[PDB]
């Protein structure tokens, strides 16, 4: 026989936390550093670069911050890839670098800095910190904002980082957590990173799964083989991402057929019905009471 600890005097002295911490999507101690602008700047916005990982999808957005809630300028989803010809393994490191490139030259095709500030065309793996150009309008910068994903050594977020940088954005970084870093002697290779970019570690399953057993090649490759993709088609697309289909970056949001405006959620039971229910229950309990006994 113990004391109930959720009393009235537990609910009176109980200040709730913030809504995004109750729904645990965020961090305010990691935001307060990233989002404020120094007061001698006077309404000069501070661009951050959101990267979100979902279990079937990748999201890459750009946004500064205001008092009315932080405001998007340019979004880049990862299921707009099968326009271009990558249909399977939609969320690997390769599409994490392809999306950050689609974001990069989307923004450059919304500001008017396409031909200037190209970035990298080839795919090598080394540092390409993009320097600004004298006389011309200056470079573009945006600070990263990963969030709640431990940035250890080999994350898919950084592939989107290397994509937007090689696209032309000027993001500060250092090659210490990229696939190819030796944690005992501190050097860095490029080809291990380019073996990890194009899809060769994904490919090697065309042996360890194609030889040793054949039953598991159909237990977990059931959409490559349905879309008729062999393990040698690890191929370039980036000239298609570069050329001209950011004149529809937004895909031209599709028109909206007129909806019936029908409802799928039962509305709130009113007052003058909740005052009527307990008269039914009191008369039913008294007419099923006095009759019986």
């Amino acid at each position: 026989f113990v004391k109930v600890v959720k009393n009235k005097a537990y609910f009176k002295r109980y200040q709730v936390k913030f809504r995004r911490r109750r729904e645990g999507k965020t961090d305010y101690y990691a935001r307060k550093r990233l989002v404020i602008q120094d007061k001698n700047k006077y309404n000069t916005p501070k661009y951050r670069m959101i990267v979100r990982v979902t279990n079937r999808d990748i999201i890459c957005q750009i946004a500064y911050a205001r008092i009315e809630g932080d405001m998007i300028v340019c979004a880049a989803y990862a299921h707009e890839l099968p326009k271009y010809g990558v249909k399977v393994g939609l969320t690997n490191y390769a599409a994490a670098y392809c999306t950050g490139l689609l974001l990069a030259r989307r923004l450059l095709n919304r500001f008017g800095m396409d031909k200037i500030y190209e970035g990298q065309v080839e795919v090598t793996g080394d540092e390409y910190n993009v320097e600004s150009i004298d006389g011309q309008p200056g470079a573009f910068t945006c600070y990263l904002d990963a969030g709640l994903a431990r940035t250890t050594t080999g994350n898919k977020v950084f592939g989107a980082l290397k994509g937007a940088v090689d696209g032309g954005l000027s993001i500060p970084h250092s090659t210490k957590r990229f696939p190819g870093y030796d944690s005992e002697s501190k050097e860095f290779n490029a080809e291990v990173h380019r073996k990890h970019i194009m899809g060769q570690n994904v490919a090697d399953y065309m042996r360890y799964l194609m030889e040793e057993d054949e039953d598991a090649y159909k237990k977990q490759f059931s959409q490559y083989i349905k879309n008729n993709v062999t393990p040698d088609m690890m191929e370039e697309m980036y000239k298609k991402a570069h050329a001209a289909i950011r004149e529809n970056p937004v895909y031209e949001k599709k028109p909206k057929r007129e909806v019936k405006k029908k409802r799928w959620n039962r509305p709130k039971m009113s007052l003058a019905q909740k005052k009527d229910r307990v008269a039914q229950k009191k008369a039913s309990f008294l007419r099923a009471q006095e009759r019986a006994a």
Binding site: Q15, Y28, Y29, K32, V35, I36, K39, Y42, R66, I67
Partner: protein
Amino acid sequence: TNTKGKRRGTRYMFSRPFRKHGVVPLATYMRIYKKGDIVDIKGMGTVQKGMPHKCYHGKTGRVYNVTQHAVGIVVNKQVKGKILAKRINVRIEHIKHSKSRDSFLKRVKENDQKKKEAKEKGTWVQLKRQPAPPREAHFVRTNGKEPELLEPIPYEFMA
């Protein structure tokens, strides 16, 4: 002979209001503060860096300086008879705007609206604020019944 510490007699003053503890909300910071604006000062116990001395909690002044994380400010104080004009350097948490100037900046505009209009009309529209005058003679209609006679209650010991 009391002491002369930094935070004498501030048990209830730097304390947080009831059920408002915790994290400083993020629309306190990203508001903009120019030079010339009028600012009241309220202390706070969370961020200990850059507190004001306890004798400014409530005063109101204007800005002369803006820094990386702080603004300078000019206030007035009364020391043993005279009045000193002194200046401090306060971090952002301990600071709000004052809305005292705003109903004047709403009445400068309303007056210049009431002046640009109807001047070309040759009209003479009243501009000065005039205090609440003595109220007008007015009729009271008692349709039908009579006023209700009151009665002072006889005493009884309530307790």
